[PDB]
């Protein structure tokens, strides 16, 4: 019954309501519950746990911070991963990030963007007799 927010430098991962947090604290793992006492802590490369009515989703956090307040619990984790996509083996998002992304998002754009700059540049000297 505490508002959880997993925010990353690229996007927001999850912002739902959470029962319990098994945070990987630097000195030692701590539990975070609906009305936990105020806290803000560094994380270490580890495996954070979120409990949804008895179900655990390994939101492994490469690292970052976590500010806990009696009202909400924002995850300042600088880098966080997920054991989804067959424990990241399928890496469906990464799969697209490899093809659907990082292949056509910029490389297709860059060649097309540079190509337009060409036929722009060459035509101006071809019309450089007006």
């Amino acid at each position: 019954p505490i508002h959880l927010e997993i925010v990353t430098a690229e996007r927001v991962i999850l912002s739902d309501d959470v029962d319990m947090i098994s945070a990987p604290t630097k000195d030692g793992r701590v539990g975070i519950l609906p009305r936990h006492a105020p806290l803000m802590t560094i994380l270490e490369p580890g495996e954070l746990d979120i409990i949804k009515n008895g179900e655990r989703t390994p939101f492994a956090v490469s690292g970052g911070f976590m500010e806990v307040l009696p009202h909400r619990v924002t995850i300042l984790a600088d880098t966080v991963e997920r054991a989804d996509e067959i424990d990241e083996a399928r890496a469906e998002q990464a799969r697209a990030e490899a093809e659907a992304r990082r292949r056509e998002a910029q490389s297709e754009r860059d060649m097309a963007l540079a190509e337009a700059k060409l036929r722009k540049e060459m035509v101006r000297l071809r019309v450089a007799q007006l």
Binding site: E104, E108, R109, A112, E115, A116
Partner: protein, 129 residues
């Protein structure tokens, strides 16, 4: 049949300057450009090869509906040429059926519609592109 042909050709001509940038464009814009390119390739015709009215009707009905989308652009002409042979040999009756009711006020019709649909589906299933 050709009202949709004319509309799609006009739309593609409106976006003709984006043919070489179709990759980084809207999905509907890319689809329209692809359809226009397929249509222009379809309208390409060799010399001394007249097409009767029923055959052109069948080809345009196949083109307007989403049938040639899977066929690649460079092979649209060969697709049409092979489909004409298929109609001329495999289904000689559908061409006559189209020609007989070409003057009907309601072009689509229910019978001719199913006959031509079945012929097109059979041709596309038997052929690979």
């Amino acid at each position: 049949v050709a009202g949709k042909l004319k509309g799609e050709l006009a739309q593609f001509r409106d976006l003709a300057a984006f043919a070489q940038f179709a990759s980084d464009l809207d999905a509907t814009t890319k689809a329209q450009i692809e359809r226009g390119q397929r249509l222009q390739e379809l309208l390409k015709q060799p010399q001394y090869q007249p097409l009767p009215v029923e055959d052109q009707v069948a080809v345009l009905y196949a083109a307007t509906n989403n049938y040639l989308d899977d066929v690649p652009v460079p092979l649209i002409t060969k697709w049409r040429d092979d489909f004409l042979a298929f109609l001329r040999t495999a289904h000689p009756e559908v061409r006559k059926l189209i020609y007989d009711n070409r003057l009907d006020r309601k072009f689509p019709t229910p019978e001719v519609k199913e006959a031509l649909e079945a012929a097109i589906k059979e041709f596309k299933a038997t052929s690979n592109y």
